[PDB]
Amino acid sequence: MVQQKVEVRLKTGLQARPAALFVQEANRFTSDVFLEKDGKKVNAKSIMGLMSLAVSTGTEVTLIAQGEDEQEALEKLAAYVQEEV
């Protein structure tokens, strides 16, 4: 019989489900999505593109949308990425 306390350190990030919705909102777009962070860059709104890299608490991402349908960018992606209540 034994018992000792420990700490957590496992990986941390956005599962594969959230990333699926990320593109869904853009699905109603018509411009172009581009996420730039830590000098790194991904194809755009690709699912595997994000799931490939990783982020942390406090981090940030540069969302760029050029066009008219860019609405979903500021409208949805902004409110969504902000988990507004």
Rounded-to-integer distance, Cα 5 and Cα 27, Å: 46
Contact yes or no for 69/30 (Cβ under 8 A): yes
Q: Does 74 bind a copy of itself (CB under 8 A)?
A: yes
Interface with a copy of itself (CB under 8 A), residue from 23, 41, 45, 65: 65
Contact 33, 20 (CB under 8 A): no
Q: Which two tokens stand for residue 50?
A: 């994000």
Query: Is 53 a binder of a copy of itself (CB under 8 A)?
Result: no
For a copy of itself, the binding residues in 19-48 under the rule CB under 8 A are: none
Query: Is the CB of 1 or the CB of 39 nearer to a copy of itself?
Result: 1
When asked if residue 66 is in the footprint of a copy of itself (CB under 8 A), the reply is: yes
